[PDB]
Each structure stands twice: as C-alpha cells, then as structure tokens.
Amino acid sequence: EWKNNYPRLRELDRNELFEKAKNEILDEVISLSQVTPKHWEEILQQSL
Amino acid sequence: EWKNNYPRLRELDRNELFEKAKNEILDEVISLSQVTPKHWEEILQQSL
C-alpha cells in the first residue's frame, strides 16, 4: 500500500522528515545569505 | 580566506560533511534499489 500510494516516494518517518526539513531550512538560509546585497539595497530603497 | 577560496561553498566542518556523505550514500542506495529489475536481468544474463 505504501509503495502504491507513493511510487516515487519511499518510507518517510519522523526522523527522516525532520532531517529533510532541517536541511531545507538550512538551504533556504544559505540562499537568503547568498543574495546579492545590491538587489536588497534597491528593493529596500524603493519600498521605503 | 575561506570565502575567497570557496566562493560557492560555505563552511564545511566534520559534522556537516559527514551528514552530507551519509545523505549521498542513502540517495545512491535509493537509486540502486529503484533501478528497473528488467535491466538487471538482461545485464546479468548477458554477462553470464
């Protein structure tokens, strides 16, 4: 039943899902920190 | 120095690198298990 309902997804328990969520949060934080400061300055100036 | 040597790579300590290696091993195992059995049977028959 698990294989049929999720042909492209394997077992996802609490530990693996929590680790994946933590990794996704870390990747999002990294991407946020990697944004060019010039775009931030332009957006902030325009909004203000 | 760390930022300049690795412009596209952030800090990679023992814990994060070990976790990334474990995740890569798990992904490789998942991909190995997800290979179609027919291709395995054909390859094994031809090799034998």
Side-chain angles (χ1 to χ4, degrees), chain B residues 1-9:
Chain B
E1 176 187 0
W2 177 265
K3 292 164 188 177
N4 284 334
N5 283 317
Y6 317 100
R8 305 175 179 178
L9 289 183

Side-chain angles (χ1 to χ4, degrees), chain B residues 3-19:
Chain B
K3 292 164 188 177
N4 284 334
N5 283 317
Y6 317 100
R8 305 175 179 178
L9 289 183
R10 302 183 67 94
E11 304 177 1
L12 301 177
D13 69 326
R14 303 192 181 278
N15 309 332
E16 288 173 356
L17 284 184
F18 196 79
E19 180 78 24

Side-chain angles (χ1 to χ4, degrees), chain A residues 8-23:
Chain A
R8 305 175 179 178
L9 289 183
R10 302 183 67 94
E11 304 177 1
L12 301 177
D13 69 326
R14 303 192 181 278
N15 309 332
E16 288 173 356
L17 284 184
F18 196 79
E19 180 78 24
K20 186 183 63 57
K22 158 195 172 184
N23 297 329

Side-chain angles (χ1 to χ4, degrees), chain B:
Chain B
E1 176 187 0
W2 177 265
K3 292 164 188 177
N4 284 334
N5 283 317
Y6 317 100
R8 305 175 179 178
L9 289 183
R10 302 183 67 94
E11 304 177 1
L12 301 177
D13 69 326
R14 303 192 181 278
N15 309 332
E16 288 173 356
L17 284 184
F18 196 79
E19 180 78 24
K20 186 183 63 57
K22 158 195 173 184
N23 297 329
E24 286 180 0
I25 288 176
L26 292 179
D27 299 330
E28 288 179 1
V29 167
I30 284 177
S31 62
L32 175 67
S33 61
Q34 281 178 355
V35 178
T36 62
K38 293 184 176 180
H39 195 51
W40 278 99
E41 299 158 28
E42 292 173 0
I43 289 180
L44 288 181
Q45 179 182 3
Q46 181 180 1
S47 305
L48 190 57

